[PDB]
């Protein structure tokens, strides 16, 4: 503050945007709320 | 040695002048030094002194970084006998 010089880094906050959604506001939907579609589910689970 | 630019807004009759700085305030300068006020007119760039803003003289001469871009220094090849035909077209641009 009294004279600029580099002393520390911070987490990135800018020049890359926010478009995330966290795990603290994650959907309440889970695989258990998934009823049907159980054949195709296995392939998504394996893929992601 | 340090100097700031100003642009000469107008002259004021009594060997003073009023200038516009690149910073937001204008300032009231006095015309001093070797450079006379028949070598300066409004619309000309002036140099200003650091401590007490004063008309040093002009040496910027309305320079801008776009003048360096306009200005070419690179020289082409190029003359006819490296221009393959179009005799009539060669002629017309040469006469104009």
């Amino acid at each position: 503050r009294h004279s600029n010089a580099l002393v520390d880094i911070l987490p990135p906050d800018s020049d890359s945007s926010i478009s995330v959604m966290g795990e603290n506001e994650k959907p309440d939907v889970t695989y258990a709320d998934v009823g049907g579609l159980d054949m195709q589910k296995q392939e998504i689970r394996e893929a992601v | 040695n340090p100097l700031s630019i100003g642009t000469l807004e107008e002259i004021i009759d009594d060997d003073h002048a009023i200038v516009t700085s690149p910073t937001m305030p204008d300032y009231y300068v006095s015309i001093l030094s070797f450079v006379d006020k028949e070598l300066l007119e409004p619309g000309c760039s002036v140099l200003l002194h650091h401590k007490t803003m004063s008309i040093v003289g002009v040496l910027q001469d309305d320079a801008d970084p776009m003048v360096s871009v306009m200005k070419m220094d690179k020289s082409p090849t190029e003359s006819y006998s490296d221009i393959g035909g179009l005799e009539s077209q060669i002629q017309e641009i040469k006469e104009s």
């Binding site: - | 937001m24 305030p25 204008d26 300032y27 009231y28 619309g43």
Partner: protein, 106 residues
Amino acid sequence: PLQVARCTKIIKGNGESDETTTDNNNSGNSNSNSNQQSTDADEDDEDAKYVINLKQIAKFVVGLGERVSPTDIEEGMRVGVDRSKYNIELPLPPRIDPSVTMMTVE
């Protein structure tokens, strides 16, 4: 160098006051900043306060000069003031358009 200013408006310390003595509005003596009588045991030097807007576009009430007249500095007049102390000392010429207008006319 004086930093360049123009008076937006004039409001006067000699009849709306500015300090606290015994009154907060209107001076009677009217050559003082705050006095309605001379038996206060105070007297001031006040001619008019003048509210100026700088070319910094910060605004100040600015002190007096050293030869300025209250009959020269009024609304619409350019004035020069100090660049860190904020006091008129020398007034400036009228207008501020001759920069663009000399080139347009031919």
